[PDB]
Design a protein around this ligand. Sequence first.
Ligand SMILES: *[C@@H]1O[C@H](CO)[C@@H](O)[C@H](O)[C@H]1NC(C)=O
Ligand SMILES: *[C@@H]1O[C@H](CO)[C@@H](O)[C@H](O)[C@H]1NC(C)=O
Lengths: 49, 49, 49
Amino acid sequence: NHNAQALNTLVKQLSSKFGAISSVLNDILSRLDPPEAEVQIDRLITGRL
Amino acid sequence: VLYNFAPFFAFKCYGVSPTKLNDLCFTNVYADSFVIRGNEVSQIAPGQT
Amino acid sequence: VLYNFAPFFAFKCYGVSPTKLNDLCFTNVYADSFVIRGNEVSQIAPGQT
Ligand SMILES: *[C@@H]1O[C@H](CO)[C@@H](O)[C@H](O)[C@H]1NC(C)=O
Ligand SMILES: *[C@@H]1O[C@H](CO)[C@@H](O)[C@H](O)[C@H]1NC(C)=O
């Protein structure tokens, strides 16, 4: 149960914005130009890392 | 084509980039028009007083 | 001395700061000159369309 719960928590962490405009990379890429989008992608990368 | 109707210098877009506006679909759009003076243009933005 | 040749208000420097431009050495420099209108000045930047 501990291992399964750890994996499920790791999966559910993917829905967090971590301060970005959205938690979905495709939405960030579609709604912003590359330079601005790089900042939001950096925030998501840091959170997921 | 919005650049052809008024001699404005640039957009001020929040949450989206102007160059991406042609790649998106919106449920509804609202155009709010009025006249202010130069000092108050900075107050048309989220979090202003 | 570039401020003495044209009545521009300020630089728009990417990857470097204008005040530091006198402290650096470059292998080559390229000056690209043209004329656009006001609406399109924002398109002279990385990641624009
Ligand atoms: C604005 O509309 C008038 C008619 O209502 C037209 O004559 C004029 O060309 C239009 N101007 C622009 C910039 O669309
Ligand atoms: C530009 O060059 C002309 C001669 O080609 C000269 O008379 C003029 O003073 C120059 N202006 C500036 C701002 O350097």
